[PDB]
Amino acid sequence: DKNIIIGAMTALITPFKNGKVDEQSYARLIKRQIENGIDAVVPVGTTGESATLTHEEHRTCIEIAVETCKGTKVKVLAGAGSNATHEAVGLAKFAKEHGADGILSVAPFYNKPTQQGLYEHYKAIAQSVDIPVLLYNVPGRTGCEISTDTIIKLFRDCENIYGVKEASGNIDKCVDLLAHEPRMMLISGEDAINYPILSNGGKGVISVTSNLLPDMISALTHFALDENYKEAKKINDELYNINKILFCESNPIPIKTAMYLAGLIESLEFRLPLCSPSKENFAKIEEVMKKYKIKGF
Amino acid sequence: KNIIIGAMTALITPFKNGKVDEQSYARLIKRQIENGIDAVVPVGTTGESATLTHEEHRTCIEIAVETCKGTKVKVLAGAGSNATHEAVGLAKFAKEHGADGILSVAPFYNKPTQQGLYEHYKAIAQSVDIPVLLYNVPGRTGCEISTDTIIKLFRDCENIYGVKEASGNIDKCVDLLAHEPRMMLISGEDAINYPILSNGGKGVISVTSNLLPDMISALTHFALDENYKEAKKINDELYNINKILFCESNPIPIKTAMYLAGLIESLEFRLPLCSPSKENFAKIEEVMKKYKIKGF
Amino acid sequence: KNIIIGAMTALITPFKNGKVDEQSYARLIKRQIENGIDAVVPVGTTGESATLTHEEHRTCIEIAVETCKGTKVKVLAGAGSNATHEAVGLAKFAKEHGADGILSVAPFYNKPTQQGLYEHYKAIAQSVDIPVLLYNVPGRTGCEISTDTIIKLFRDCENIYGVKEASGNIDKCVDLLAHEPRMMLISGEDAINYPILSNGGKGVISVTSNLLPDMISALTHFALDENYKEAKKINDELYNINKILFCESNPIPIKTAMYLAGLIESLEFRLPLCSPSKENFAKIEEVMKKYKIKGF
Amino acid sequence: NIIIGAMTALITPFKNGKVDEQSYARLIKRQIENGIDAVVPVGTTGESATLTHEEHRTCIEIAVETCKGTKVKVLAGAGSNATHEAVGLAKFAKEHGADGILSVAPFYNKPTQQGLYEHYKAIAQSVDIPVLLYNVPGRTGCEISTDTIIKLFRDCENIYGVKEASGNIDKCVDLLAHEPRMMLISGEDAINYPILSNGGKGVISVTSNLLPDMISALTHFALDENYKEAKKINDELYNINKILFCESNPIPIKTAMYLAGLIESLEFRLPLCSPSKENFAKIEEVMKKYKIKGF
């Protein structure tokens, strides 16, 4: 067996206040996740704008999530990925030492490493910390794909690598992974197809939508895990529209807009190169979120 | 809505000395019937529709209808074309010769607009009174039937009852059944038969079932009975051969497998189709060794 | 090797009341000849090969042959098919009826292997005496004639002399001529006509030249006399019309432009092709206001 | 004010995990002595992702100093997916004597075209040196549209052009058809000549690390409108140009540089690593057809 982190998980947004991380808003939003049945939170991944945060700010947000989830069942799967292995190992070690329950480690973006290099990148990370490591495959952002072979190899050569967050929109790869290695934890990184991944043996989601609708994603996930597929699918069908529209511009631009429109964050701020959506998409985002029940504080 | 669903087989078309082996063909069809397949699809992509003449195409359909007559098995005839007047012609023949419905592939090569697709299928649908199943396979056609075009066609034409998706895009499958849950979504992609069925898909049109009709049929019927544990287990079992049967363009691998199993007596295509590369020949031969292949 | 190069035109096929307007056809060809076009391509993709009957396809070949007889203008017959027997039949017909050479598209929809592509083309090449030009257009066919396959065919079949490239892959164009500089690379993508020529390409088969035969012909001939600064100038000038002529699937825009120019009687397509949306009709009309369009 | 002609995306030699500063300098003088117009320190080929900001800055300084006293320019790699990082690098490059900056489109976080505009505008407004845009969609996950490129070129005095590494010659035609005043730079060695023949005014080359004399000859022949000669060299280079991307750059070029004895050790920083054995053999075989200049 491996130590694992599964269930409904939220890729937390990082609220900015005057260009700075609004720390108490961050905590409040996490509390709102915990209160709405979310099993784990992911501080500062892609939805958290890890790219534009400093390493020190990145570390602070991880701390905040750990301290907020302390005294609860809610796990903290810290975003610890990088395209430089020495940076990712640094983040993994920090997350380890500061009480994170595990780490999400995105495939190296931009430098397009080979499957061999991907193996060593992750093997390095995993042989540096005690905690569970979730792989993260998102080819549309990184420019590289962790093949099924490499994922399964890493799972079978590293004790603490327990699965992969898939965001490649490739249901065939999901079948491939769980048919050859049924011990790994397949996690959906693509909200629109949450239910299909879960129904094929996936064991959780890391959601953008759950930022806005944590109660609905949590219910979807737990229905699926208890094999109530008809109700899990019902929710996944209801959510399809907003699941898509949260991607009309690059995540996290729409989700942060929605949070702002819902009165869940005080100001709509991004760090460059991220910016507000066009006024057209702004209205489009306002349009879809009006068709859903949105939990308060 | 009258419909055709369940476990369905995209039939291969055996050749002898370059001619349609009508005796082997009918013998292959009843092997499907005996193994619980719900419907057969004569001369589709797998049946090499591209290189059959219109008269051979028509012969295969009639053999399918006649062979299935007296059983419960239905005939969803391959009737597609990239020229609408050709497709309408095929559909009219299919109807007038006892087929239960038609499978109509999206126009290839000429790349019609969505408006052209709608009129293509509206024309086809209005020429017969039997069920019509749309067929989306963008990787072969260079064209996509959008979700909107599919939904409009379904709503506007009484005999269009759904779509065979062979696109590797589970997101579109969610899209389709979330906005129009009344349509019949059919898996045209064997590897992911189960994921499609689990989201409300109502059948498969299979290549693998040429070889393993019993396993494909059991998979489909388990899923239709909401026994997802069993349907998934079989889908996982079938994954290796589901992939290897597409290591080269279908239906080169499936014909190869049927040859190795002794179900057809020569491995013959019509050009530009030909034998697999020998490395893929070896893969197919060694993969199918892990499965039990029923005979006649 | 016998070759057919220079500025070539993929002839549109005008329809009146659902039938091939044979009179309009010859008129459009005369217009091509009078503006310095080196060769014409009857019934390719631009000529709606998919929706023509075999009988009609043959009719259009003969017309171009007759109209060009008496002239120095050669006829490069569109003779492609996704079925090898169909392609060979067209190839032979073309030889017999005076076509100077044949254009042969890579098999669409059924997706043959490189080996299958080799045997497909080898069959065509040896069935006739005239030059054969390969046609690579993966966006429409679903398959790619690899560089190695193109070159192997070039070396093995005396009459296969080059390839019409429509893949937007200038890397591949370098690959071909760096390894086999004797072959005739022909541009099948108007927007990048000039880069193809400047890398040693020896001709174009153009969609735009239907509307602007004088400009395309001038571009190619400037290029061939190594006057690249002039060839680039025309290519730059032509970029707007080149792109807008594919705002919807070719030949929907080029036929629309020809109609707007008053060069054809009606804007008529065979399904699944149809008229452009009103908005794209406007775009095309808008763009061609910038160019001097030659009369009949 | 511009930086054009034959340019080299410098590899970054490593020795015991550290940047071999003196090997780096020696590699640059070798580029200067072979007719290279400018060197690009620490871009993609220079493993910018795995260098620290300190090593990144050190490399720029070395390139600047090594080139001082010569006609050779230093187009400093300064790109980042965080604008405050890119501006930082931009200001460092300016204040330490670089002639301009190469700035990659933000990778991974996938900015909108509006974000790309504000990103580069912020960068262009922070320094007074020339700014070359860099478009490599296959690595960044986003494309700078032709519109955004042309917009930025016009609205900003120092944005002078773009390095295109997208294998899309249609786009190159588009860019120079609507804005011929911009400097289109080839970032794809295999198609250096076609980009030059359509109005491109130079290359930023991976191949020139190994064969600087041949790349600059190709470039200059083309710039002198000797297209017959530029093409022949481009044809001769096609074998090595393609094999240098059999694995992700810069794995093949560093392998080639090592095999040629131009660097001490075949050393990368993870997630980059040595090529496979078969690719190592393919690389070794093709570079046997080329004369590799020494120091």
Ligand SMILES: NCCCC[C@@](N)(CC[C@](N)(CCCCN)C(=O)O)C(=O)O
């Ligand atoms: N949350 C932590 C900060 C993230 C830093 C960085 N913006 C850039 C990372 C980097 N590897 C740094 C290299 C700097 C020197 N070239 C990169 O730019 O690739 C990213 O990973 O997105």
Ligand SMILES: NCCCC[C@@](N)(CC[C@](N)(CCCCN)C(=O)O)C(=O)O
């Ligand atoms: N199923 C029996 C008929 C098969 C014929 C054909 N090979 C060719 C189809 C065609 N529309 C024929 C037009 C011939 C005139 N150019 C095509 O080639 O596109 C195909 O449909 O793939």
Ligand SMILES: [Cl-]
């Ligand atoms: Cl670079």
